[PDB]
Design a protein around this ligand. Sequence first.
Ligand SMILES: [Tb+3]
Ligand SMILES: [Tb+3]
Ligand SMILES: [Tb+3]
Length: 136
Amino acid sequence: AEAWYNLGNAYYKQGDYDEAIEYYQKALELDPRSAEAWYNLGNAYYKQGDYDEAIEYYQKALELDPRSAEAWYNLGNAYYKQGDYDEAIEYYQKALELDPRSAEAWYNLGNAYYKQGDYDEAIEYYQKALELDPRS
Ligand SMILES: [Tb+3]
Ligand SMILES: [Tb+3]
Ligand SMILES: [Tb+3]
């Protein structure tokens, strides 16, 4: 499994997401235990624009390891990209509960409320982002 995984990683690093997907899938067939590997497979689908696949593999990562702020955040991002703003909000909140340090994540939670048309919460979360990083 580890060898196929590392070949997927090398393709991923040069932006060959369809090859990364084929080799990650072969790795996971041999050993499905790593939350990180399912997360990397989700990322490959996300980079290709196949958000429904990214969601299925991020969910599998989080079933294995639910304290990954990064997996919750990317899950939120995949729902955001489908226009599922209510889900993005839920998973962004879960991410920020685990790790409130990223200005960018507070901003994206603000963006999801804005897209819902809930301007109060958009302002609340944009203000949290700008307190952390006022440069954009
Ligand atoms: Tb290719
Ligand atoms: Tb596609
Ligand atoms: Tb699909």
